[PDB]
Amino acid sequence: YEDFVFTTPYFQPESTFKSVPKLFSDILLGGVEWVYT
């Protein structure tokens, strides 16, 4: 670019329209441990 070289592989513009359906995933702060007394 402006007196600078940034080596990157060939960009694929088709990756923009990649169908990625969102999946359910819930985090439970406060859950089960490995062992109990």
Partner: protein
Amino acid sequence: YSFVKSLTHNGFHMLRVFRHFAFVLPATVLAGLGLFVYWGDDNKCYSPDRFPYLKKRAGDMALPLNSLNQ
């Protein structure tokens, strides 16, 4: 004094409003005969099917609670 004998109101007991407590102390004392026969968890069940038996065989080591299943 017998609970059964006081039911007819003909021996020594006409009105006994707590006659249904008469055999609680004797039944409790007779149950004390198994005080030492059934002491602790191992004497009241088949211990190898309980979790504490596994901890003993592992050298008194803590195990996950589902160790009996895996």
